[PDB]
Curated annotation (Swiss-Prot), chain A:
Part of the 50S ribosomal subunit. Contacts the 5S rRNA. Belongs to the universal ribosomal protein uL15 family. The chain holds residues 49 to 144 of 144 of the full protein. This is Large ribosomal subunit protein uL15. The lineage of its organism: Bacteria, Pseudomonadati, Pseudomonadota, Gammaproteobacteria, Enterobacterales. One of its GO terms (molecular function) is structural constituent of ribosome. One of its GO terms (biological process) is cytoplasmic translation. GO terms for cellular component: cytoplasm; cytosolic large ribosomal subunit. The gene is rplO. This protein binds the 5S rRNA. It is required for the late stages of subunit assembly, and is essential for 5S rRNA assembly onto the ribosome. It comes from Escherichia coli (strain K12). Keywords: Ribonucleoprotein, Ribosomal protein, RNA-binding, rRNA-binding.
From Swiss-Prot, chain B:
Surface exposed on the 50S subunit. One of its GO terms (molecular function) is tRNA binding. This is Large ribosomal subunit protein bL33. SUPFAM superfamilies: Zn-binding ribosomal proteins. It comes from Escherichia coli (strain K12). GO terms for biological process: cytoplasmic translation; response to antibiotic; ribosomal large subunit assembly. The lineage of its organism: Bacteria, Pseudomonadati, Pseudomonadota, Gammaproteobacteria, Enterobacterales.
Swiss-Prot record, chain C:
Residues 9-21 have a biased composition (Basic residues). GO terms for molecular function: structural constituent of ribosome. The gene is rpmI. NCBIfam families: rpmI_bact. Keywords: Ribonucleoprotein, Ribosomal protein. Gene3D superfamilies: 4.10.410.60. GO terms for cellular component: cytoplasm; cytosolic large ribosomal subunit. SUPFAM superfamilies: L35p-like. Belongs to the bacterial ribosomal protein bL35 family. This is Large ribosomal subunit protein bL35.
From Swiss-Prot, chain D:
GO terms for cellular component: cytoplasm; cytosolic large ribosomal subunit. One of its GO terms (biological process) is cytoplasmic translation. Part of the 50S ribosomal subunit. Cross-links to the 23S rRNA. Cross-links to the A and P site tRNAs. Keywords: Ribonucleoprotein, Ribosomal protein, RNA-binding, rRNA-binding, tRNA-binding. InterPro entries: Ribosomal_bL27 (IPR001684), Ribosomal_bL27_CS (IPR018261). The keyword Nucleotide-binding does not apply. Belongs to the bacterial ribosomal protein bL27 family. HAMAP family: Ribosomal_bL27. Residues 1-14 are annotated as: Disordered. GO terms for molecular function: ribosome binding; rRNA binding; structural constituent of ribosome; tRNA binding. This is Large ribosomal subunit protein bL27.
Amino acid sequence: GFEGGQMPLYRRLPKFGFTSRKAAITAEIRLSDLAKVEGGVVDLNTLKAANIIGIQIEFAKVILAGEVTTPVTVRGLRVTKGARAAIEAAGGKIEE
Amino acid sequence: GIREKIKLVSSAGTGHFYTTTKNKRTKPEKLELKKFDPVVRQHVIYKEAK
Amino acid sequence: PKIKTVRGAAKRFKKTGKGGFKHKHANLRHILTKKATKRKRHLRPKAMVSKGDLGLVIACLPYA
Amino acid sequence: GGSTRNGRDSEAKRLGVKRFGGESVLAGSIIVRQRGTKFHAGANVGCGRDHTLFAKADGKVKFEVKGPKNRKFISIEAE
RNA sequence: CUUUAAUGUUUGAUGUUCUAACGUUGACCCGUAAUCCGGGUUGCGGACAGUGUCUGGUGGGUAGUUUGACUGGGGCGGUCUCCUCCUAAAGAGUAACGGAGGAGCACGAAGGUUGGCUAAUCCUGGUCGGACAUCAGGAGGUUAGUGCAAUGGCAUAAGCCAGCUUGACUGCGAGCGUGACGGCGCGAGCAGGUGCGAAAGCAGGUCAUAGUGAUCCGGUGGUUCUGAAUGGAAGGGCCAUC
RNA sequence: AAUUCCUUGUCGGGUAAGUUCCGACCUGCACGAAUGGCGUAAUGAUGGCCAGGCUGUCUCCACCCGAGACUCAGUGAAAUUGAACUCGCUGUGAAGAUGCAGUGUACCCGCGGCAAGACGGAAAGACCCCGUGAACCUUUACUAUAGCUUGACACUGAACA
RNA sequence: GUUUAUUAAAAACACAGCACUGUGCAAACACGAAAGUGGACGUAUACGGUGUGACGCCUGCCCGGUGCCGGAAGGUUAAU
RNA sequence: AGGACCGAACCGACUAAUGUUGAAAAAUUAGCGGAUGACUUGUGGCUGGGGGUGAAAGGCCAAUCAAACCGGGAGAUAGCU
RNA sequence: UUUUGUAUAAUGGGUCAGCGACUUAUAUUCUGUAGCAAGGUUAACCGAAUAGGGGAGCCGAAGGGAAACCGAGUCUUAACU
RNA sequence: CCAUAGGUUAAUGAGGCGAACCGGGGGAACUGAAACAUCUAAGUACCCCGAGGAAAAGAAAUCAACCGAGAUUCCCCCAG
């Protein structure tokens, strides 16, 4: 970022530090992939076995992407008003 | 110099306030004026200078 | 070796849904006694780096 | 001593000439405190604090050989 | 409310009395006829030193580094930002230790608005009373005035005679001007509430351009935005801000 | 005046004349009393002027004896070396030409002797400036700190006024 | 006499004498990642630091600045 | 008795001239100062690197020292030739 | 070789021959090229050990917001804009 | 005096030198911050005492977070 001295732009901009501090415990899944669950249930305990992201997850969230191929059964998770309706239209269940 | 800048607050003591400079040797009356509140959407006296 | 992320940039610039990096405007914190709202409110919409100015952070954010 | 300083030029030059303007808003001919030497009309009467001749409309200058006495009364017009 | 002393008592300090901490800058004897001093025995001094750590002060005995750029040697003197003026060759641009002046603030009025006004000066006549300071006439006047330069404009006054008062406000804004950039200049108009006016209409400060200063660091007004077991708290962030 | 612009102060001594030496006078721009004031004796590998001596130092050089230089033999180094058909005078010119524009003058290789040049041979110029170069030195810059010193905690005890 | 072995040997400094100031002896003072030693097997006519120059004729005024001592009227002051 | 004389040994380095790969890195030639005192000199030992020695010159400490000889830090550092 | 200009009283060069100065590892943009493809890929390691296994973990498939939060939409806004 | 220091016999250990790794203790400047002062250089270079086939580390007075992990060490990741 050196520009001949003359106080460079990366020092004239303000400092930040406050962040959401939860990415290492928060998993993000989308209805366009790993959403058939092979007849099983979508749950935080089975996500920790689904060959994805590992065991340190404390929160799992869902986003509405693509279309829902199965009458999927979900227990818990943080799920949008759209994702709850895209699964309803496919014959699925959301347990909370 | 060194007069210290004035702070003017409404009677609710809220975190929205005006800041200005005033001459120390003229007009010793308290600086107060009637102006708007950004949440209550009404005119109030802003006062309590020094 | 891995190369480090530069704190000069990683406490200044953020990533978005478009190529480049998004930042705040300065001249909004220190002594506002002579700054009317028409010279404060308008300093909050944020701006981007995206030209020959991006080639100055291309080794500052090597993992963004 | 005192010299040369002179600081900022601050522009204040002409623009509202011939057939200038188009797809975007024009600032018109700007001057340094002389109020009559390049006078205005229509959408570009402006003169907020610096004699800029600004508008809510876009187009070219009409730039006509008419206007009260020595004043030019310059305006922009739709095509 | 007081000015304060003594009986009793706690103690800094000072003296005295004593040996329990401690010096050995005392001595003899053993090692050993070792001019050392380890041991052994006995004195002297004694809570004084000595030994460790803390604290204020004095401070090259000892240590390291800094001490600018522009100009026809170097320095001195001048200058370094903002405003203004001449140089710029009749488009844009620009050089000269080439030529000259201001600002680094002030006003809740020198701001907003409704209703009115126009000034400087000289000559004569007349009063103490003015090169002229109150008046009438005859001439003359952006040769007066703006909170302050310099330049420009002002009476459809932006200059000043009165009245009533904060639009010197919060969120939003098509955009346009300048400079390589940061930065800097101007802005139609909405919604909310306010000011002046019968009303039209006007006001988001000061006729227009100067009274400046990014980020860091720290501080203050508000706050279910956050807050590493949980729940408060401390500190952040957002919004106001020094 | 090892202090002073004007200075060779100025009067006088010394001299054929004397910015130099002395006696004296004191506008010491800005001497002066123990970082003393000022003078003698005695001393010095000590400062300056005058005079007698010495004499080829000088006036004006010349012989007399020897050493090297000179000519070889034997043994045989040193710094330098763009290329060398490197001659005047004038012009031009990285603005003072051996060589190019003009016009003149030289047998070649040596050889004792000279040194006006070749901006000769030897120094990674000293001079003056320049560099947020380097290192020491000073201090009424800046930041650190021993030594010494003030009070104190603790080893560290008993009591009376 | 001594100083610049090599561009200087001269007027520097040494030095009988004169004067100040610290020091009572586990002296003052010095060297130390410290015991140990030096001062001194001495003892205020002794030792440390230092200005002035044999002997003579003599030796003005200033404590306003800085340094050091002596003091307690006032401003101000640490650990704890 | 003499930091007494005149003057060799012994010491000196004031001065000129010949030197400057010279027989020579202080020697040569010719003057020329001192010479019983702060004189002169052998052999052994002592004082060490920020530390010595010095009647104190950036002089002396193995032809260097206002900071030496031998190695390492190291391929220090040139907005530069 | 190099400095408005160089036959330049600028600079270098006695000579013949050896030797003599840009390397890959970490990250990335632009370019070529290749396998798979909404997926792509293994590291260390194990392996009769250039096959094969190993999917840890990374890169990608969703954005708006300081963050809570919302999400094919979203922040600020009374937002109704 | 009792003892201990010295004297004495038997047993067991230490003593000097090597290549690197390694344990504890001492420890720069130049350098990186395009200058420099906290920071960095660097607990390196170098020195001192010393140990083993390794040394160091270990079978929790650690982390976690309502769900539990669970001796130590090195390689690839978590992660620049």
